Amino acid sequence: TKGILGRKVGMTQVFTENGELIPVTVIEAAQNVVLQKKTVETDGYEAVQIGFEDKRAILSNKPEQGHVAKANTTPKRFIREFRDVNLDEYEIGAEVKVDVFAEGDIIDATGVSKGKGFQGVIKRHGQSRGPMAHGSRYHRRPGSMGPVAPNRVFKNKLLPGRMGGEQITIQNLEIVKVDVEKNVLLVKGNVPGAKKALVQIKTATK
Amino acid sequence: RTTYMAKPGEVERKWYVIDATGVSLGRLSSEVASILRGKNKPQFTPHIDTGDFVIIINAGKIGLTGKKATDKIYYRHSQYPGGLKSRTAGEMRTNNPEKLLELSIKGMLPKNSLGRQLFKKLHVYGGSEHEHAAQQPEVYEL
Amino acid sequence: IVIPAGVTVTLNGSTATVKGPKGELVKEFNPEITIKIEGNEINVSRPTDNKNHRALHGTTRAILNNMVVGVSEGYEKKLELIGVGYRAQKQGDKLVLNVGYSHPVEFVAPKGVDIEVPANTQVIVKGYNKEHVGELAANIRAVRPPEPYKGKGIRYEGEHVRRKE
Amino acid sequence: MKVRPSVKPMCEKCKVIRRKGKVMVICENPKHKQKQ
RNA sequence: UUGGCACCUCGAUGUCGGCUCGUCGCAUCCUGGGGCUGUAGUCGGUCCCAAGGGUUGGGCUGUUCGCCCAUUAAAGCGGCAC
RNA sequence: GAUAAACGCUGAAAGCAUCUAAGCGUGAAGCCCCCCUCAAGAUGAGAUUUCCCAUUUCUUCGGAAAGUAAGAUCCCUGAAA
Ligand SMILES: CCC[C@@H]1C[C@@H](C(=O)N[C@@H]([C@H]2O[C@H](SC)[C@H](O)[C@@H](O)[C@H]2O)[C@@H](C)O)N(C)C1
Ligand SMILES: [Mg+2]
Ligand SMILES: [Mg+2]
Ligand SMILES: [Mg+2]
Numbered sequence: 257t258k259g260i261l262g263r264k265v266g267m268t269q270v271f272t273e274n275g276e277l278i279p280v281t282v283i284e285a286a287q288n289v290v291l292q293k294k295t296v297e298t299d300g301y302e303a304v305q306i307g308f309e310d311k312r313a314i315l316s317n318k319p320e321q322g323h324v325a326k327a328n329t330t331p332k333r334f335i336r337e338f339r340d341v342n343l344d345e346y347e348i349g350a351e352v353k354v355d356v357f358a359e360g361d362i363i364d365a366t367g368v369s370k371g372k373g374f375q376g377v378i379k380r381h382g383q384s385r386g387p388m389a390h391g392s393r394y395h396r397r398p399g400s401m402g403p404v405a406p407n408r409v410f411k412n413k414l415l416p417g418r419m420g421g422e423q424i425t426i427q428n429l430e431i432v433k434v435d436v437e438k439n440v441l442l443v444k445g446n447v448p449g450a451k452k453a454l455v456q457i458k459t460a461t462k
Numbered sequence: 463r464t465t466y467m468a469k470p471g472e473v474e475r476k477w478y479v480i481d482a483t484g485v486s487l488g489r490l491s492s493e494v495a496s497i498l499r500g501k502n503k504p505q506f507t508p509h510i511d512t513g514d515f516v517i518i519i520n521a522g523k524i525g526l527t528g529k530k531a532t533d534k535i536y537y538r539h540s541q542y543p544g545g546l547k548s549r550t551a552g553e554m555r556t557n558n559p560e561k562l563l564e565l566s567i568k569g570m571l572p573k574n575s576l577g578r579q580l581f582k583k584l585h586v587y588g589g590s591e592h593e594h595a596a597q598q599p600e601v602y603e604l
Numbered sequence: 605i606v607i608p609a610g611v612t613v614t615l616n617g618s619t620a621t622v623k624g625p626k627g628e629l630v631k632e633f634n635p636e637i638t639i640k641i642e643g644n645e646i647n648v649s650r651p652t653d654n655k656n657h658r659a660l661h662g663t664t665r666a667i668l669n670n671m672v673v674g675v676s677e678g679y680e681k682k683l684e685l686i687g688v689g690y691r692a693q694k695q696g697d698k699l700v701l702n703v704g705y706s707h708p709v710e711f712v713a714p715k716g717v718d719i720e721v722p723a724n725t726q727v728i729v730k731g732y733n734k735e736h737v738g739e740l741a742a743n744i745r746a747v748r749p750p751e752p753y754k755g756k757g758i759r760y761e762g763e764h765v766r767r768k769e
Numbered sequence: 770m771k772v773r774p775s776v777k778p779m780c781e782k783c784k785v786i787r788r789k790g791k792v793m794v795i796c797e798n799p800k801h802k803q804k805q
Numbered sequence: 806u807u808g809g810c811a812c813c814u815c816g817a818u819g820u821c822g823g824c825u826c827g828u829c830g831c832a833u834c835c836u837g838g839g840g841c842u843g844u845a846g847u848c849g850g851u852c853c854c855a856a857g858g859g860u861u862g863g864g865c866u867g868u869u870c871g872c873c874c875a876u877u878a879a880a881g882c883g884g885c886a887c
Numbered sequence: 888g889a890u891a892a893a894c895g896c897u898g899a900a901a902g903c904a905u906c907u908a909a910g911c912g913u914g915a916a917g918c919c920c921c922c923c924u925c926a927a928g929a930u931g932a933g934a935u936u937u938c939c940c941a942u943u944u945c946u947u948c949g950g951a952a953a954g955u956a957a958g959a960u961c962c963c964u965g966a967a968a
């Protein structure tokens with residue numbers, strides 16, 4: 257199981273050798289370093305901690321500087337753990353390049369979905385509108401809060417509230433191209449998040 | 463008038479270690495509840511906590527008579543519609559015995575703020591080893 | 605119960621070990637039921653007379669008898685494939701049956717059981733542990749149990765299959 | 770299988786037994802299988 | 806369900822159908838497992854286990870219901886102030 | 888992985904028989920996992936890595952207050968929020 261951290265650059269399309277045209281997400285994954293290895297003896301579980309993008313000194317504090325000094329590297333914007341990896345691979349301070357993947361590798365992409373702010377039940381939960389005419393005064397409303405008997409509302413009556421900005425995993429995206437000199441992965445289809453969003457690419461759990 | 467009342471930290475609370483191997487789940491629990499509550503001390507004061515600390519070891523070997531291992535069901539409700547989960551006493555004695563004994567003893571403690579303090583004095587271990595050697599626990603017989 | 609030549613029946617507390625020529629067995633019996641060892645003969649001791657003990661008695665006898673006869677001459681359950689294109693093959697340690705399915709069905713015998721196949725139309729299951737022979741033989745029969753209309757499928761060699769139109 | 774509160778021998782071959790605290794009759798004739 | 810009674814509510818407990826939102830039971834409509842069959846096969850019948858998910862769009866009528874058209878794996882039956 | 892109905896193996900009680908009493912196996916879209924998300928206010932408040940260090944004057948006493956460290960905020964430019 258291999259893993260890397262990249263930024264979503266954007267979407268485009270590529271023609272396959274076949275001739276088919278496929279949509280791709282461009283993930284730029286430069287400056288991934290191995291910062292720490294967690295073992296069962298020390299931490300209670302196997303994981304490798306990867307630091308992604310380089311960050312100006314004045315944006316880092318002394319606690320951060322002390323943690324990346326152990327891996328002889330500069331402060332890092334994003335630090336994430338990968339579990340289910342082989343710790344025998346990964347030396348502390350080693351770069352992690354996008355060539356840990358190959359064209360045809362099936363990956364899971366994890367990121368935070370775009371923020372839509374306060375949203376109603378129609379957009380947030382795909383509920384149906386009431387009629388728009390025939391005397392209706394019920395358009396974009398949540399529906400009955402429930403029956404009478406329990407003198408209260410059950411605990412998953414879906415209602416308006418803040419919509420996106422959740423963690424999302426898309427499973428089984430094909431890697432379409434790996435460009436090491438550009439530190440670029442091309443992934444078939446889309447991954448969560450706005451442009452410039454952290455994307456965690458790891459080998460498909462399935 | 464003149465009846466004695468224990469003050470907090472007046473009565474010496476002792477540490478006891480009790481082997482659960484073979485004893486009916488209740489029977490163990492009912493005796494332990496009395497020790498936690500302090501019902502075995504003449505200084506017993508209903509509002510204070512004069513009881514002792516209890517370590518139970520070998521909770522995995524606790525006794526369940528009849529078909530209780532398969533037929534005694536422990537229920538939890540999440541408070542979500544249809545959120546009732548169930549476990550057999552048997553499965554719980556195999557995988558989470560610390561939980562089994564805590565459920566059994568919690569039910570036999572007073573249902574109040576002091577009852578919740580008494581529960582904090584109970585330490586259950588599936589096996590034979592605890593990490594409370596510093597507290598110099600004394601073996602207790604039922 | 606009579607012990608034959610080569611058989612060494614020992615007793616370690618409640619559990620009996622019976623090592624013979626064909627193989628070796630270890631079966632744990634109920635404590636209170638006590639079993640007496642002698643140079644040639646074995647007798648079982650029923651202490652009290654309660655439904656529990658009356659039963660266990662006959663079982664501890666039966667199983668010990670089975671164990672002992674198990675390591676002496678042994679146990680052979682024999683199966684008989686019926687139906688056009690039903691054939692058994694023996695390739696290594698895998699009994700490969702072709703019994704009318706789109707896939708072939710394969711069986712690896714456990715530790716002590718052996719599946720020799722004289723003819724393609726019949727199978728035989730040798731072993732010392734009688735229940736282990738019983739189970740494997742049943743598991744093989746389970747693949748295509750005899751059907752009532754043309755009697756096709758895997759039967760035991762003595763089995764009496766009910767027949768319909 | 771016949772599942773019914775009244776379980777009883779339907780022919781001379783029918784045997785009444787108990788499995789797992791359930792009365793049943795087993796028989797050579799499969800029509801006579803009954804569980805209570 | 807059709808009822809019986811008149812115990813809460815007449816200083817008001819809004820009453821049918823639909824819409825929105827469901828949630829629960831299982832006496833299961835589909836899908837899963839299985840026994841018997843007057844089970845050759847393909848289809849079925851009947852019973853047992855099973856409530857995870859699923860369980861259509863129209864014509865007529867205020868309707869519920871029902872009939873019909875066309876589908877569907879299936880077009881379940883009930884409770885929650887019908 | 889463990890089970891339901893069910894099917895068995897071995898097997899007495901009950902010289903037979905019997906899936907069951909002791910003992911083994913098979914066996915469901917269901918149960919528990921596996922998959923996705925939240926989650927230590929899990930007051931039972933967990934763990935790992937890293938950073939700062941032992942200041943001053945009072946307080947009989949316990950403790951208090953008042954400059955700071957690492958770090959954070961106010962304020963300001965904003966949006967991917
Ligand atoms: C078969 C009906 C049985 C009776 C119904 C109910 C009643 O009187 N409802 C009032 C209601 O009028 C308005 S709704 C328009 C009010 O807002 C509402 O609160 C309420 O008073 C009116 C409809 O008659 N009674 C308690 C029992
Ligand atoms: Mg937004
Ligand atoms: Mg609509
Ligand atoms: Mg309007």
Ligand SMILES: [Mg+2]
Pocket residue numbers: 406407
């Ligand atoms: Mg209430």
Ligand SMILES: [Mg+2]
Pocket residue numbers: none
């Ligand atoms: Mg009257």
Ligand SMILES: [Mg+2]
Pocket residue numbers: none
């Ligand atoms: Mg009023």
Ligand SMILES: [Mg+2]
Pocket residue numbers: none
């Ligand atoms: Mg049912």
Ligand SMILES: [Mg+2]
Pocket residue numbers: 866
């Ligand atoms: Mg109309």
Ligand SMILES: [Mg+2]
Pocket residue numbers: 887
């Ligand atoms: Mg109504």
Ligand SMILES: [Mg+2]
Pocket residue numbers: none
């Ligand atoms: Mg038998």
Ligand SMILES: [Mg+2]
Pocket residue numbers: none
């Ligand atoms: Mg299994």
Ligand SMILES: [Mg+2]
Pocket residue numbers: 916
């Ligand atoms: Mg499915």
Ligand SMILES: [Zn+2]
Pocket residue numbers: 778779780781782783796797798801
């Ligand atoms: Zn009969």
